[PDB]
């Protein structure tokens, strides 16, 4: 199989600027066929570039394409607001079909920690056998965040998961939500619950902490 | 009008298969060829598999040469892909594209794509969401944040509001995630200056459709 | 004073590939042309330019028969103006043919349970062929803009494909063995009455 790599995983630009992105292959293409596509959340893949350096129908002029070999480029002249999408890279001429890992294309803006909050369990919840610790990361910039739980001084993996929003509208932050999930029992036999938080806006990690039965 | 349109919302048990349908309009089916990418929520394209109209021969990744036969029926200018013994970790968007040709030429690409097929594979049955407050610290201050847990539902989605609408600003609903469980977990969020904790009520509006659940919860400050 | 040899065409033990389209000269003989349309074995019978009946009282400096297998939707393209895979990229008669075309059902005989692999027709190629012209060559089929020299891929198919005849299909995609008489008349003595 031919693998595909896509270089940077975040691309943070101002509207305006000139975009540059990088497409990999492990080896040399079957027949110069790299695909460039461009995803918007929530829709359909639409075809920007198709066979190395020929743009595809309806697709505005400031997107350009080049390559030969293993290494390609996708250019963006002059950077429309309509154009901050996540974009793909596809190589089809050996049977076998490979996709990229993609590249996001964000607004860029100034370095904004988050504002770190952390939810003990309700007592509703308790009353159900299952106890949910939540940690929100709120407004931050960029999209490169840590979270990591621990219960009693002690690093905790697994039964947790996080969720991202999307690029807000009006302030260009991401918010983040990582929640631990344990039963009644083993929630009940700690005291100390907090989630530390790294970021690039924070010199040194953040951590939001409570005491259990301690309000 | 080149137009690919496919099968609508798949919901199969695990363990059995899926046949969704990619329909052609606009171009001469015959000579183009068609290939099956999937797109699980918020996750990269994942290249499937490939057939060409005319020959019907097929191609396959590696990752889905057991379960998944993709075949064509030029009379009805559909082609159809398979995926039997189906999992939760099938639960994706199931796309298919091909490009436009004529009776004897083509594009050099894939730039005709289908709207999308939802398949969703979970053995867990239809349930309504239990929903928990997120109660604001005390060690708040200039501005704190409050929301809901909206935990253990299913089938996806749901609809979340804050004073049915009145609030808006500061407000963060973030995607639900599925828990080994088979049910979603969702939680939203809000932040609001510390000094309107006590003279301002914060009530989240949680709408689940396809069990008919309207739960509004009231958040409130801790208090000991 | 000696029968022409339509035996060896119509009762071959085996056809040809409708591509590769058989075609046997018939000259200096007695055609009897009688049994031929009183066949009832026959599913297919169409005379374009001569009368079915009106056609012993009648002679001919050449007569040509092409024999080929197809699928019994196709059975329709062998007739003077028609379009199709068959009738574009395969045998094409022309808009003024003088002739018959007769074909018959043979799922009994040219189909194998596994799928006879042996029948080809041409699938893809640039331009439709002229009127009896015939194309053998497996050249790789170049479909999109940049070519391939021989690379069976993306937009760059082998041009010939298998029929893969079963005993289970319908009618449609069932073979049928064709036979196609031409009727020349040149300005050379005459053999074929
Ligand atoms: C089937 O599709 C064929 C492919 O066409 C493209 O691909 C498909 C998938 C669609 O996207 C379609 O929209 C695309 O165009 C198509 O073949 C094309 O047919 C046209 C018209 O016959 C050809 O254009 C004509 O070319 C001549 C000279 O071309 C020479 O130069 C080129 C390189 O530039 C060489 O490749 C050629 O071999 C020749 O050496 C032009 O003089 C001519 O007119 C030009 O001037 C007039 C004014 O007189 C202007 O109005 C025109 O806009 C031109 O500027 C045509 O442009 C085209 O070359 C040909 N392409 C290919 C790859 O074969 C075919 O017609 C379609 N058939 C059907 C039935 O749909
Ligand atoms: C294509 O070949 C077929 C079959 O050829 C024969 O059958 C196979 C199984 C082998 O045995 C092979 O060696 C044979 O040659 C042809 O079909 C037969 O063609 C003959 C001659 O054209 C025709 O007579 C058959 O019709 C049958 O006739 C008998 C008797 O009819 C006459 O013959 C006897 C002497 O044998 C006379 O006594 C009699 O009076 C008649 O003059 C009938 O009893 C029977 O019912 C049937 O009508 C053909 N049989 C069949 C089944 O088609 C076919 O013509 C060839 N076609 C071409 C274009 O060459």
Redesign the interface.
Known sequence: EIVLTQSPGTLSLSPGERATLSCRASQSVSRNYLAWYQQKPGQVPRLLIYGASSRATGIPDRFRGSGSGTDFTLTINRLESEDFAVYYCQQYGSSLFTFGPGTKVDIKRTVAAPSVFIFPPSDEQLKSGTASVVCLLNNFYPREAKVQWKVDNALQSGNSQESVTEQDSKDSTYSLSSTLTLSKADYEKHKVYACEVTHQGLSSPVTKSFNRGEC | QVQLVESGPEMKKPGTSVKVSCKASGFTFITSAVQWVRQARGQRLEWMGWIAVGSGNTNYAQKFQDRVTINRDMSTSTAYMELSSLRSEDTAVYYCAAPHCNRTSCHDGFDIWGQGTMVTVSSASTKGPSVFPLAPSSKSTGTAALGCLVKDYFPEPVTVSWNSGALTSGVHTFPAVLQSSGLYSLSSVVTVPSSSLGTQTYICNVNHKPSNTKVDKKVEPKSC | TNLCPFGEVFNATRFASVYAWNRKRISNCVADYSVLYNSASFSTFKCYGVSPTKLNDLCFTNVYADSFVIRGDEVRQIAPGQTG?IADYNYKLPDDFTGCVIAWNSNNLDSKVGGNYNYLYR?????NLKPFERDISTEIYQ????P?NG?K???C??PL?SYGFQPTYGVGYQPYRVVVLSFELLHAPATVC
């Open positions: 895979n699938l893809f190629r640039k331009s479909a999109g803009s940049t391939c690379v891929g993306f937009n198919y082998f494909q």
